[PDB]
């Protein structure tokens, strides 16, 4: 742990990237977090909302 600053910078960047990756699969109030499933299941007006 003599290089704590560089490790901390790398960990913060990885944590931010992983958080974005995790947020990619959030419902956000929609019926599903998978876009392809929504498109293959729902009609174009409700699909687009």
């Amino acid at each position: 742990s003599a290089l704590g600053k560089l490790q901390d910078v790398v960990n913060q960047n990885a944590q931010a990237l992983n958080t974005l990756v995790k947020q990619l699969s959030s419902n956000f109030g929609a019926i599903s977090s998978v876009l392809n499933d929504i498109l293959s299941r729902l009609d174009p007006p409700e699909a687009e909302v």
Binding site: I31, S40, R41, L42, D43, E46, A47
Partner: protein, 50 residues
């Protein structure tokens, strides 16, 4: 069945046919939620409750 004793059937392990229902057009109410009634119900489901 009567409404209070609503009868439930499980549609399991069979190739579904939804096209005949849509194209029949004798069923006045055709309101579909989640899945769309405009020829998209031709998919696969783990469990269908009727």
């Amino acid at each position: 069945a009567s409404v209070y004793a609503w009868n439930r059937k499980r549609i399991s392990n069979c190739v579904a046919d939804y096209s005949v229902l849509y194209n029949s057009a004798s069923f006045s109410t055709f309101k579909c939620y989640g899945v769309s009634p405009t020829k998209l119900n031709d998919l696969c489901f783990t469990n269908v409750y009727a």
